[PDB]
Design a binder for this molecule. Structure first.
Ligand code: 3HU
Ligand code: 3HU
Ligand code: CL
Lengths: 257, 254
């Protein structure tokens, strides 16, 4: 409706959403910059909606209580306190049962963060061996995937990183990067994050194809009239190659040898 | 409830099961897509009859804007689902409803092993090694419409000389890679299926132009959300990974 302004829930995450810096006072949506803002601007332009960006108040993506209770941007959608979530919000089984997702505007998975010029080319290569230690941030989506996987190779990798846990499982992504940087360690991690780090640590590389295929989708409340239009606009933008440039724009470092 | 599912003959998604005796109905077919179908059938609780798309097309538009293929069968409500490697695309999604992708892919390179070529850029910066795509296919289209300069450069190369670098179809392209110093740009799934069966070939570089296959339904279908969710379940159960490995794995390339 022409009257209505859509509330867009989102979350602070480099480089999707960041407070912008400026020599002049900023207001409203203008206070933010980033990939997700560009995406939003493009979607708004195509669909004709006006929007109002609000950080999710608990600052979480959206997970479920041991007691079936949701938080994060997911909870905002369920309660119709937001019309859209535009953020690196992973499409998953549990989430898709409580809210509606547009098709992925970004497609990703788990990948390997490691050094250059080694025989290592895949998870399989990692799994087939023990001399180079590999792992994940403790209790991350990446680690959770391995823990829960019924796929032989991954089952083997989990046994590995759980067996060496004090070593193999790191506190957070920062410490994990340092491990790769400081040790003969390979870090499994959400591919997009790996790609960001790679553009800024010239002696790091992203190894292998993508494991655990998944996408980021714009979240909507079940039944939302906008979801379908948003899928179409996303595809339009992929068609025009515009998503690739947006990715490029916000992921690019300042050069790498 | 019984659903009509349109699909299309395609290795290794849909194939004639080989048997000494006569086979009937759904039992005639096997492949990655019949496995997915059975698997979504069990989660959603539906019966289905597999119907090969009569014109044997995926689905595209005339200059009039008339559709064909499985896409047309959906628009006309002659199928309830299309379960096949149907690429989710902008123009298709305007006329049919897609589930979220059960397989993600992109464009990659098909070449021989043991050369220094590691990327499209390595191919682009050079002329001894010929490279191309199938004429009029999605790969060519992508390359033709691309504003990325490396790709613009590759495109000018491919299309030069009455397009001697293009080929009529992927079988011809495959053979050309096999018998000639020639690299083939193509849909990565088919590339992987080929490398599994030609030990001296490989995929060069990574994926470009990300995209995915979804189960098509007619606009407004109640099955779309239910299949999306079944697809996510199967992904998390790791069943998609197993289905993929089952049908893609060759006989070992030692
Ligand atoms: N997409 C996620 C949020 N999310 C996310 O989980 N991770 C993964 C992660 C974060 C700390 S450890 C860890 C791991 O994978 O081991 C991201 O890297 C990320 C970048 S943008 C949004 C992200 C979501 O929808 O919940
Ligand atoms: N997904 C497509 C159908 N389709 C497809 O286009 N290609 C690629 C291709 C075929 C001839 S040229 C060409 C190219 O990449 O240049 C496939 O390899 C494929 C494997 S299963 C379904 C497939 C569709 O929805 O129309
Ligand atoms: Cl962290």
């Amino acid at each position: 409706g022409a009257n209505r302004t859509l509330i867009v829930t989102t979350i602070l995450e480099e480089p999707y959403v960041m407070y912008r810096k400026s020599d002049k006072p900023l207001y409203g949506n203008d206070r933010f910059e980033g990939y997700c803002l560009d995406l939003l601007k493009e979607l708004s332009n195509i669909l004709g909606f006006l929007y109002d960006v609000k950080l999710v108040p608990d600052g979480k993506y959206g997970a479920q209580n041991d007691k079936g209770e949701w938080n994060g941007m997911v909870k905002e959608l369920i309660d119709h306190r937001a019309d859209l979530a535009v953020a690196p919000l992973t499409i998953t089984y549990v989430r898709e049962k409580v809210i509606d997702f547009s098709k992925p505007f970004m497609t990703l998975g788990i990948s390997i963060l490691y050094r250059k010029g080694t025989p290592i080319d895949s998870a399989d290569d990692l799994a087939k061996q023990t001399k180079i230690e590999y792992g994940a941030v403790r209790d991350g989506s990446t680690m959770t995937f391995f823990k829960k996987s019924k796929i032989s190779t991954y089952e083997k990798m989990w046994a590995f990183m759980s067996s060496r846990q004090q070593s193999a499982l790191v506190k957070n992504s920062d410490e994990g990067i340092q491990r790769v940087l400081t040790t003969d360690y390979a870090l499994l991690m959400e591919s997009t994050s790996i790609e960001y780090v790679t553009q800024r640590n010239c002696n790091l590389t992203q190894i292998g194809g993508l494991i655990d295929s998944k996408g980021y989708g714009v979240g909507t409340p079940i039944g939302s009239p906008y979801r379908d239009k948003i899928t179409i606009a996303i595809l339009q933008l992929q068609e025009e190659g515009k998503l690739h440039m947006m990715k490029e724009k916000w992921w690019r470092g300042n050069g790498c040898p």
